Amino acid sequence: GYLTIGGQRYQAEINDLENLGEMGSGTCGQVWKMRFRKTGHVIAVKQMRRSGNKEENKRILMDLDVVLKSHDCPYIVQCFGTFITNTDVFIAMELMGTSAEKLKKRMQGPIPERILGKMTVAIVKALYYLKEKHGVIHRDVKPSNILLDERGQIKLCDFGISGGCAAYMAPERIDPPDPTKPDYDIRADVWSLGISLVELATGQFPYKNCKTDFEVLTKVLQEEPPLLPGHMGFSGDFQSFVKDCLTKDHRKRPKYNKLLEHSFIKRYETLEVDVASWFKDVMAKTES
Q1: Which of 49, 204, 248, 273 is deepest in the core (most CB within 10 A)?
Q2: What subcellular locations does the record give?
């Protein structure tokens, strides 16, 4: 085994990791929280069993393949290394605090615009990075794929990172202009970002009481885009950013290179926002 962590590279075996308990399983599981005995760093170790589900393993490896290539992107969770035994692969990842989905649940309400500003800057830069550097279109941008930590970091999650959920689907993905060719572009992921931002900013998923996925698709197409409400004191920058992302006609929808010059992103690039303390407090005062 090989870990690159704390600025050094260590030869390591699975025995050098102290198991601190299971974190989760069944999607890109199974995930252990572990401590590296040579340094005291705590990490998340995802285990891919050789006897495990073939569709599950394929997803794990396609995601791992992107993560390994994105070491130079600070907005994407990092892989410290891998251990391959005769029966398993253990994948050592940066351990994050929780997802934005859970954070909305813990808070049972809106996340503050200032935290969402910092979130938008990070996640657009991750997505732009994935498209420009690797040609990857994420296809599943939603709050459960946005991770936050006690260090104040905000990152796009490793899960499904190689490129999802019907609820965040863009109108052109539901109603393709022409299925082939090619399919759709990064603009679909821009729409999903917009939906995620509205959900997080208001505390509620914007298509109300849909009983099925198909019902949300129907509302996406039949209804007006669900913009920030005007009675909540959102800044004009933020509303315009959401309204740009939620442009139903995809041809008129801005790409990342344009979103990155939007006033909402420019302002949040430099605004001092103490995401780490906010996150510690929310995690303190919570759960629900």
Answers
A1: 273
A2: Nucleus; Cytoplasm
Contact 209, 239 (CB under 8 A): no
* Residue 155: CB atoms within 10 Å: 22
Domains of the chain and CATH, by start: 1-96 (3.30.200.20), 97-288 (1.10.510.10)
Sign of CA dihedral 58, 59, 61, 66: positive
Sequence-distant (≥ 6) Cβ neighbours of residue 44 within 8 angstroms: 23, 31, 32, 33, 34, 92, 93, 94, 95, 96
Any binding-site annotation on 27?
yes
Q: Which residues are bridge partners to 82 per DSSP?
A: 2, 91
Q: Is 30 labelled as part of a ligand binding site?
A: yes
Q: Edge-to-edge strands of the sheet including 146-148? A: 98-99, 146-148, 154-156
Active-site option among 140, 185, 237, 244: 140
Q: For residue 45, say whether it is annotated as part of any ligand binding site.
A: no
29 among annotated binding-site residues: yes
Burial of 17 (0-12, 13-18, 19+ CB in 10 A): buried
d(CA 63, CA 159): 6
80 phi and psi angles, rounded to 5 deg: -85, -20
Whether the CB-CB separation of 279 and 150 falls below 8 Å is answered with yes
Experimental method: X-ray
